[model samples]
Target: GQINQVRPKLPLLKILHAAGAQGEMFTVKEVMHYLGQYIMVKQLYDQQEQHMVYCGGDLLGELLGRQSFSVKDPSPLYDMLRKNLVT
Candidate 1:
């Protein structure tokens, strides 16, 4: 089911895959998972330091930039996470 839904978009995915491969080969799902983990870890670290972590701008930019390969105007998802900061 996942492959079926994704197969039709191979052309665009190919371009993105190539681009990302220049640095590292990660799927969109993998990128999201990493970002979620990064946010949680950073938040916990910041809490221990008794201050809010400035992860919003950098994390949002990274997530938005990476996700743009598969989704258009990913800001809504970023906005939701900016407000809630959960996976």
Candidate 2:
């Protein structure tokens, strides 16, 4: 699925960002600090893998937590999915 396709791009993106940060192009510490946020984002995506099984049904609806269901779209999801990509 999309995750399978996008998963392989993350390492390259991280390396590119890390290199830029280390070279004084940006704050390496700031870039590194996002590492945890990235991991958490991945976890959320993984959770979607399970949630998608029941798409258009109650299981999908239950996954919304406190967020509104109307805003779940490809853009934001893809943005999170490609967080490490260099663009």
Candidate 3:
């Protein structure tokens, strides 16, 4: 199970970017410009959640989209979510 086995979709190597654009070693923070988050990332030295850089999966799960998804009611996008998460 390689993480970066493929390029994701956004399809910018996935909306999640397989452990994020720099791989799982680093925790990333996407920027919110005018209305939404961007693709470029800001690193959070050691997944430091205190600063609230990246919202992480669970926070996202809790804050679903039109919405989002969880394992309980997985997003309809779930079909592509797996491949997108780590491609």
Number of the top candidate by TM-score? Answer: 1
Candidate 3: Cα lDDT at 13:
31
The list of candidate 2 runs beyond 4 A from truth reads 1-24, 44-87
In model 1, what lDDT does residue 73 have?
41
Residue 78, candidate 3: how far off, in angstroms? 2.6
- Score each candidate by Cα lDDT: 0.39, 0.34, 0.31
TM-score of 1: 0.31
Top candidate by lDDT: 1
Cα lDDT tens digits for candidate 3, 1-87: 332234333443333443334333211122112002321243321243332333244323223332222224434335444544433
Tens-place lDDT digits, model 2, residues 1-87: 222222214443453343342222323334434433443343333455433222233222232222322233444333433553332
Question: Model 1, residue 85: displacement in angstroms?
Answer: 21
Candidate 1 local lDDT, residue 30: 49
Q: Which digits, one per residue and each the tens of the lDDT, describe model 1 over residues 1-87?
A: 232211213333333343342223344554445444554554423445533333334544353333222234455545543443322
In order of listing, the candidates' clash counts read: 0, 0, 6
Candidate 3 local Cα displacement, residue 41, angstroms: 12
